[PDB]
Structure formats: C-alpha cells, structure tokens
Design a binder for this molecule. Structure first.
Ligand SMILES: CC/C(=C(/CC)c1ccc(O)cc1)c1ccc(O)cc1
Ligand SMILES: CC/C(=C(/CC)c1ccc(O)cc1)c1ccc(O)cc1
Lengths: 215, 217
C-alpha cells in the first residue's frame, strides 16, 4: 500500500500517441521536423486534459493554470521522451512509431539537442527511474515551472507541496534502502529545465528560419 | 550541528568590492565594465573556495575544472541573491555596487536583473539561512551537470556528501517543516535558468565587443 496521489497519477497517464510519419513523403529534415512538431502539437492538446487530473491543479485560477502550462510544456514533453527511452541505447522514443537513432538525428539536424536529451536519459537510467517517480516528476515539473506571471504564489506553492509530499512519502515507503532518493530525484530537475530551454531555443531557430513555419 | 556545513561556513571567502571609477562618467559601458571586472576577481576567489569543498580537489583536475566551467555563473548569481535578501527590488552585486531599477535600465540589464530578483523573492519568502546558502552553493557546483565528467561515480559521491549535509542540517534545525530540504533543492532549476540567461547576456556583450575586453585578447 503506497501513496494515493502517486497511484492516481499512474492512472491519469495518457494513452500512447503516434507520430504517424507520412511514407509517401521522402525522408528529409523538413519531414522529420514537421513530424515532430505535429506530434508535439497533439501531445500538447493531451497535456491540457491530463493537467485537469493533477491533484491541486484545477483549483488554480485559469490564468495561473495557463502560466504554469506555458512555462513547463517542453519539460513535460521531454520527460516523456526520456522515460520512453530508458530501455533503449542511444535512441530516443519520441513515439512508438518514431524512434530516432544517431543517423536519423544528423539527417534532421537534431544531433546536439538529441544528445542533450540522451544525457537526461543516462542519469535516470543509473537511478533506475520507476514509472511512479516519472509521473510524479512530471506533475512536479509543471507545478515548479517558475512562471513569472503567477497571480497566486501561495496557491501554486500548495500545489508544489502536495506533489512534493507524495514523492517524499512514496520514496520513504518503497525505497527505504536510500533515504535520499527523493532528493536525488529532485536534483534531476535542473538538467530537465536546461534541456527544455535548449529545445525551445532550437524550435525557434527553425520556426524562425522558415523551416516548417507559417508561424 | 553538522561538520560539512560548519566547514563550508568557515570556507566562505570575504567580501569583494566592485570599486566603481568616478573619473569615468556613468554609462552602460561603465556598468558592464564594472560588473565584468568584479566577476573576474570573484572568480579567482571562487576557484580557491572550491578547493576547500570536501572531496573536490581530490577529483581529476579535469573533472574539477569541468564542474567549475558549468557552474561558475550559478555560484556568482547565488552570491548576489544571498546578499540581496535584506533589500527590496535591489541587487547587491557588492556592498559598494547596489543596483536599483533605474540603474538596471541604464546598464541594459533590466530583464536579467528582474529575473535574478525573482530568485531573491523565492529565497526571501523561505527565509534562506546562511547555512543553507553555503550548502546549496556547494551542491550547485557538484550538481552542475557538465557533459565532460570523466569520473561520474566520484562526482555523484560529492553530490551525495553535500546532499546528506543539507538533509541532516534541515532535520535538526527545521523539524517544523519535514520538507524544507526538498524545497531548497527545488529552487535549483530557477538558479540554472537564471544563470543561463546571465551567461547568454554576457557572451552577447562580448560578441558585440561592447566592453573593452583585455585579458590578453
Ligand atoms: C525534440 C523534438 C521536439 C520538438 C518540439 C515541437 C522540437 C521540434 C523542432 C525543433 O527544431 C526543436 C524541438 C519534441 C517533440 C515531441 C516531444 O514529446 C518532445 C519534444
Ligand atoms: C549580472 C551581472 C554579472 C555578470 C558577470 C560577467 C555579467 C556582466 C555583463 C553581462 O553582459 C552579463 C553578465 C555578475 C557580476 C557579479 C556577480 O556576483 C554575479 C553576476
């Protein structure tokens, strides 16, 4: 018997989402990037519904809800990719039907970024990150996104406390062998934030270059 | 009482002053020039401070420089933040160089300084103590995530030694909040984010050659 928040978060996990790359269209960076952006777009739609399932989130004002999502969507997407890539080696599982190896990365111009994301994967691998910890870290990442536009700081901190508490309690009961596992999990957040920032900046140097824009 | 924390306390370098020059009329170039020179001198002191962190100088000199290379700005920023806790909407880069909103606009540092203040705000609300400050500073260095680390295991060991010290300190001094250590650790992402913005601003200024950069250049 362990944490109810954690079990609930496991139950609230979105069903698999597919990239669905178009076979008819020949491989090319514009293709890969176009595919990754459509996938992300569809995942973002899902993240909004998913967020309603987070204990303590729906009680925030709509403005604060949007501010948190706006600041943490990339961290949430990246964590997902990372968790799906744990049983793999030097490959990123953006989706079951879209797994990127080194060559597919070079061919898309995502070598640097994908290598940075692989660094997150590596750290979580060594720790043997569990699905329970993964879902709790996603919610924590959302609550701890540090938006400068928050209207109700106290309420946001309460969301953080509730999820932080769930993690600490889960670790206390399932990993008594390492009394600092909760802390180690929290210490992975800086790299997540850092990697998300590099991804966002990348998504701009291309949306910008007229890569696959209109935006 | 905690040994690691006590040691970090006495290992604190003493104050470094900015020493702004009056023969020079205030401008943006003056502010940037001043801040860069201040950072340069703080960096010399930081390198020596790191050698006193338990298990640090014992790492390969490569790993040693790797952690510093990835964490120097976070360490600089945490200092400014800590020194600014007692103030309001002001940044104490040094006792003789306190920047308010007006000065930030003049140096073209309004957005960066506002971001740094966001960090001050969080720590002010938590009532960050000196003991927690020095410990987080050491943790920021050890948890800097350099992509060049040779001995990962040893670096993780260093993180664990500092983390245990923080966890132990919070258990004794703050049994009132059984989650204080975790909350301290949760401020690290904002520290990384703000430092990244600082570094980006810094290298853009260099790229633009906006500041008369010596140093052998
Ligand atoms: C790194 C690819 C990516 C994105 C986000 C749309 C991207 C696309 C193009 C770029 O130039 C940079 C990042 C992404 C897609 C789905 C996820 O679950 C997580 C990340
Ligand atoms: C944010 C100003 C700054 C720097 C350090 C070089 C700076 C200067 C000019 C820039 O364009 C960007 C950053 C700094 C100085 C002392 C500290 O303890 C911490 C940070």
């Amino acid at each position: 018997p362990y944490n109810k928040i954690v079990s609930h978060l496991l139950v609230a996990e979105p069903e698999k989402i597919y990239a669905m790359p178009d076979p008819t269209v020949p491989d090319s960076d514009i293709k890969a990037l176009t595919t990754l952006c459509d996938l992300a777009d569809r995942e973002l739609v899902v993240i909004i519904g998913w967020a309603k399932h987070i204990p303590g989130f729906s009680t925030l004002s709509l403005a604060d809800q949007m501010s948190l999502l706006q600041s943490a969507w990339m961290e949430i997407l990246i964590l997902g990719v990372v968790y799906r890539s744990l049983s793999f080696e030097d490959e990123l599982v953006y989706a079951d039907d879209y797994i990127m190896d080194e060559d597919q990365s070079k061919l898309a111009g995502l070598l640097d970024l994908n290598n940075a994301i692989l660094q997150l994967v590596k750290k979580y691998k060594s720790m043997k990150l569990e699905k329970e910890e993964f879902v709790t870290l996603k919610a924590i990442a959302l609550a701890n996104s540090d938006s400068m536009h928050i209207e109700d700081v106290e309420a946001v901190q309460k969301l953080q406390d509730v999820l932080h508490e769930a993690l600490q309690d889960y670790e206390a009961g399932q990993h008594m062998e390492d009394p600092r596992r909760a802390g180690k999990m929290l210490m992975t957040l800086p790299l997540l934030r850092q990697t998300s920032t590099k991804a966002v900046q990348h998504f701009y140097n291309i949306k910008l270059e007229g890569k696959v824009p209109m935006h």
